[PDB]
Ligand binder design. Sequence first.
Ligand SMILES: CC(C)Cc1nc(-c2ccc(C(=O)NCCC(F)(F)F)cc2)cs1
Ligand SMILES: CC(C)Cc1nc(-c2ccc(C(=O)NCCC(F)(F)F)cc2)cs1
Lengths: 191, 191
Amino acid sequence: DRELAILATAENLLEDRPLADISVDDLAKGAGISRPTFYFYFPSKEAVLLTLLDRVVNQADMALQTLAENPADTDRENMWRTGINVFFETFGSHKAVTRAGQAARATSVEVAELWSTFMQKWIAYTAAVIDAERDRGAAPRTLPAHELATALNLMNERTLFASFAGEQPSVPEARVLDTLVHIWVTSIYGE
Amino acid sequence: DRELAILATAENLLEDRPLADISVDDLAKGAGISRPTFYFYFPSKEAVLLTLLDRVVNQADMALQTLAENPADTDRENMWRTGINVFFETFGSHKAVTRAGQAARATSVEVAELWSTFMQKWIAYTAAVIDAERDRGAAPRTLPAHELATALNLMNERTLFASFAGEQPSVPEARVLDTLVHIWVTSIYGE
Ligand SMILES: CC(C)Cc1nc(-c2ccc(C(=O)NCCC(F)(F)F)cc2)cs1
Ligand SMILES: CC(C)Cc1nc(-c2ccc(C(=O)NCCC(F)(F)F)cc2)cs1
């Protein structure tokens, strides 16, 4: 309620500057409440970013769970594309939260642990699907599936987020999905 | 001389704690000089880390230039392995400088610009070799070479450095070279 207003204010302000330049007073004003009233909702501006990141991470996670439960009727290249696309659209639709949440991994144990927990979950699901593809005879038994899954997930983390931030260097945002799908499909199905 | 002693002290202290916990006084003592004498060599402890990172980055760069000028007589999988191995051995032999240098990208424009300049150089060289492989008919014309090169370089950055830091998640350090070579070779030569 007022919680949603604080979160919306923070996501808005993060589009024009870093969390280090946003004061508890800034978040209070945008939500139509006082500073002490802010502390009834959150202990710190750091907790507000942790909550925004938690919401975006869980949105991606539930979108991937939806795809897992509702297999698309398409070839294996388009199957992998739908999965990568969850992360491209979810994080790419919340660039300021993505940028600030990644930066906070350096200074917040809670943000680092959240990121680590979900990356472990997404890697495990990737490996399980590679294993299923090997079990059905579509993919060759090359690298250990979990190691391959880990490197492909870390590739997507660095490459998506560099593209969203317009880093130099980066893959243009309009090319990054096709780029990652190519590398996933060749490395999963290639002898 | 005393410069080399300051650099060695800093690389030593970075193995047990972050630069934020190392004082100009710490570096001065280990080099056998006073604090004001330290400032004759470097303006800041941040400049000392910038110099250590510059040395390691240039070591990798010159090792890659050496391989480029002295082609190994081996198959294309071993050719790509020798190149990735430059980064695995160079950065993997200087883990504390790697970890601290990557962390400083967030707060030092000079460190960010150094990292960006060399990543651009290594990506450009990767693309030129993929192009040569396509020109000779060994690799298929799939993705734009520069986009493929960028994603493979960013994969190696995130995956090598997570492995060196023992992040969760990470590829074990003893598996990371084979993991990356597989992904490079399948994505470069795969239809
Ligand atoms: C859904 C099925 C049909 C296809 C599948 N897709 C995935 C999948 C998992 C993780 C990521 C990813 O991009 N990780 C990195 C996330 C990031 F936020 F770090 F980028 C991409 C794809 C697993 S099984
Ligand atoms: C030498 C020939 C025979 C094979 C070749 N190898 C490369 C090559 C370039 C960059 C990286 C890399 O790992 N970048 C990322 C660097 C990092 F420090 F970020 F990890 C790996 C391989 C280019 S042509």
